[PDB]
Write a protein that binds this ligand. Sequence first.
Ligand code: HEM
Ligand code: HEM
Ligand SMILES: N=C(NCCC[C@H](N)C(=O)N[C@H]1CN[C@H](C(N)=O)C1)N[N+](=O)[O-]
Ligand SMILES: N=C(NCCC[C@H](N)C(=O)N[C@H]1CN[C@H](C(N)=O)C1)N[N+](=O)[O-]
Ligand SMILES: C[C@H](O)[C@H](O)[C@H]1CNc2nc(N)[nH]c(=O)c2N1
Ligand SMILES: C[C@H](O)[C@H](O)[C@H]1CNc2nc(N)[nH]c(=O)c2N1
Ligand SMILES: [Zn+2]
Lengths: 405, 405
Amino acid sequence: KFPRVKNWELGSITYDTLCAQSQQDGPCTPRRCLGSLMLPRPPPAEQLLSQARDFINQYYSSIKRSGSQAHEERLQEVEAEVASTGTYHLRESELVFGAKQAWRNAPRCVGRIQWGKLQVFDARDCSSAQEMFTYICNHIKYATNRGNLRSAITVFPQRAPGRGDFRIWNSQLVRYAGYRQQDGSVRGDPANVEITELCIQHGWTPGNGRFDVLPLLLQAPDEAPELFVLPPELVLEVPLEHPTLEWFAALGLRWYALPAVSNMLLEIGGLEFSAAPFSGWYMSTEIGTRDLCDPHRYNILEDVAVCMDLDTRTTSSLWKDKAAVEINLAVLHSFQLAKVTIVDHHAATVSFMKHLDNEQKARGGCPADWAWIVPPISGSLTPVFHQEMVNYILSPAFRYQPDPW
Amino acid sequence: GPKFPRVKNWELGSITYDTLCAQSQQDGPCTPRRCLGSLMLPPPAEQLLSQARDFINQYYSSIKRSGSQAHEERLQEVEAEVASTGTYHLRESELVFGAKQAWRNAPRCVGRIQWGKLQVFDARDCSSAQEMFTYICNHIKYATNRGNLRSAITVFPQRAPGRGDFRIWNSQLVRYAGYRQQDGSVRGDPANVEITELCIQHGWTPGNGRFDVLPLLLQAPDEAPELFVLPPELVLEVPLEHPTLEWFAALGLRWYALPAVSNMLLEIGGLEFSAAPFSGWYMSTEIGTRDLCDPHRYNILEDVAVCMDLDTRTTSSLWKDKAAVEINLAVLHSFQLAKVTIVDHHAATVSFMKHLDNEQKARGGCPADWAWIVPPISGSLTPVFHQEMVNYILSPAFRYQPDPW
Ligand code: HEM
Ligand code: HEM
Ligand SMILES: N=C(NCCC[C@H](N)C(=O)N[C@H]1CN[C@H](C(N)=O)C1)N[N+](=O)[O-]
Ligand SMILES: N=C(NCCC[C@H](N)C(=O)N[C@H]1CN[C@H](C(N)=O)C1)N[N+](=O)[O-]
Ligand SMILES: C[C@H](O)[C@H](O)[C@H]1CNc2nc(N)[nH]c(=O)c2N1
Ligand SMILES: C[C@H](O)[C@H](O)[C@H]1CNc2nc(N)[nH]c(=O)c2N1
Ligand SMILES: [Zn+2]
């Protein structure tokens, strides 16, 4: 019934009772576990009302005013609005709580210890791409804070029956262009070829570098997306150098300071916010290991290996591991040098272990996707590796949604 | 596409559908409500016969005589034997096929590309602890083959109706003693404290080293386990040295050449071989990262970092990652130097990807435990990290079984 959860380094055990609260099915079945899969393979009033009531219930419990008159009243309002219109609207205070909870509930996020400190920007009174742009710029400016990153989410208008969605076509507010060159090779970020091509097709004048910040393609309901170039001065970047390998800086690598996913759907009380970009700060391995070393990304491992006089002749010399480490070291040093918030995978995983403990005491468990929580390098050297985790869907939730094009 | 788990490789963008999972006749620990994929752990002649029939069909299918007279005759013979005795026996060739399929079916084994080359030693005539010892020594001699390791499995008599099980108490045929000290610390391998104390409780005169090879506690049916000291000349060990760090050899570290899980249960067609130790060869991270660096194992990370003069006071220096890499390198280098078979995590995972391809063609899929297949260090640097995997239980299988004490 309730999963027994063990930490194999400490021998300690817990029981996840929070999973019982899951109302949404994951991809697994007793026949086969698909936990390693990255993505999943006008709503009826009843369904919506139950999700809304549940969320409103979560909200009043949150302020320790459950059952109160304010609680009864609010539930009536939602009920009244759904019955008459088939949908309802959240009050800003609920939206704030809901966004924090979606973050707290994100199984793939290792930075959830920060969940309670989230600046929520209510952008639901946005009626045009132009306005979306203004709010996005404010988010970036607020969130960056001159390198002293602060967690934030900007919430745009909720989806509405039979009307197009507000959408940010970009997968992140800040991302580098990926230009396909004859050879089939890609200049810049291969993960962003399609979006780069969409921007171009929509009138963007493309650059030709390896780190060209993409412009935003913002879409107001049922309108073609519009292009907006982010003011370069709002986009903080960090040049990468190594603390002892002088030649590192010569690779001309750099990365943006602000990780800001912008293609996920924020679901709260049955309401869907198709555009709700959020940002916290980077864990170094995201940049040092995945962005820079994934073979299908910048794939710089070999280059750094060679620059290190490593024997890339054989895998047994562990040249890849060695290069990967210095790259990650480079990222950390650089961000620390540029005084831009960044957390290493050890500090991060240790704080996530504390978060697991906080959540165990607070809610009796914590949904966590082990494959995502365990860092991409030095997995077992971090505490989360030895920690069993239970993965399930709690709502409020951030979820994937189809690309708008 | 089709109606089976859609499996994607995110590095190559390639897709496959697992149809093999349809053959799974045993539930795993996951449900639509939650994924427990990261958990280390989780006779009615009627139930046996169905498993036995299934296995005989598997066997006859493998020799392409499915539906043949021999096939129907064996099926009838098995039902008859089970009918009059409650159990049945496998023909030699069936045992060989079964042991190989069990390995082939092992979701946690990254070395499955070698599944077809398993040397199956039939020890089903073994009738005493002393003889188990002889069989085990023969396995070790044959498997070690002076360093040019050969995968092998020695199958002792299957579990019998009322009779006691043949059991090897040790978790592996070769493991180091773990001596609980007065100050609570452990000298040797903390993972082996219990078995070490069990060997003492059974008359073993304990050594006092950090690498004392444990004796074997072998148990023939309904008899207390007997203690057998492996002749040192049969236990090949590899003193650890680093290719460049000359002081590493001074740490006096060493590991044994033959990894030989000896406490797993080999299940074939419902028959249970409680003693069927198997061995292949090591993937270097098993020793270098887990055995030597797990905080709950030899925990030598800090010692090596101090020797490397790293800043162990801060996580951001990545001292753990740095030392871990060197330790793993020392392991690969030493085994290669000592001419003892070993495979690094890069070679093993690439070979496993080939295996996935082979199996996709041969069986329409391959059960794999992602958390276990992806190596403990440099996870995303290997191809399996970017490979979605479907985990399910097929039979024949190797299963954990309770410790006999
Ligand atoms: C404050 C510091 C934060 C850090 C250190 C952090 C770190 C991480 C990391 C390492 C991942 C995995 C990223 C990947 O591999 O693609 C992740 C994923 C995620 N985080 Fe956080 N996070 C933070 C803030 C936030 C905030 C503020 C939100 C939302 C309000 C959030 C929501 C999520 C979600 C939904 C995922 C999954 C994203 C996906 O599936 O692509 N995170 N986070
Ligand atoms: C030929 C060389 C082989 C290599 C390189 C290899 C490598 C591995 C590795 C790295 C693991 C994970 C070990 C751990 O993390 O504890 C493993 C697990 C396993 N291997 Fe293989 N293996 C090989 C041979 C074999 C053979 C001959 C068999 C059986 C006939 C086998 C059966 C298994 C099983 C059942 C597991 C899971 C054990 C457990 O749950 O503790 N392997 N193997
Ligand atoms: N630190 C993060 N990280 C999440 C965004 C950065 C991440 N490294 C990234 O590039 N995400 C992409 C690529 N993989 C995700 C996916 N689902 O495919 C989206 N978030 N935050 O708010 O502080
Ligand atoms: N390469 C192996 N590896 C499996 C045995 C060595 C492995 N590194 C080990 O120490 N396994 C122990 C500790 N963890 C496993 C468990 N289930 O707890 C058993 N086997 N082989 O036959 O070639
Ligand atoms: C196939 C596998 O699920 C996939 O590569 C996952 C593994 N773990 C991950 N972990 C994090 N943090 N981010 C990712 O993108 C992934 N990708
Ligand atoms: C909790 C988690 O399942 C556990 O630490 C697993 C992770 N992956 C592993 N992978 C391998 N190969 N071996 C192990 O012992 C483990 N331990
Ligand atoms: Zn699962």
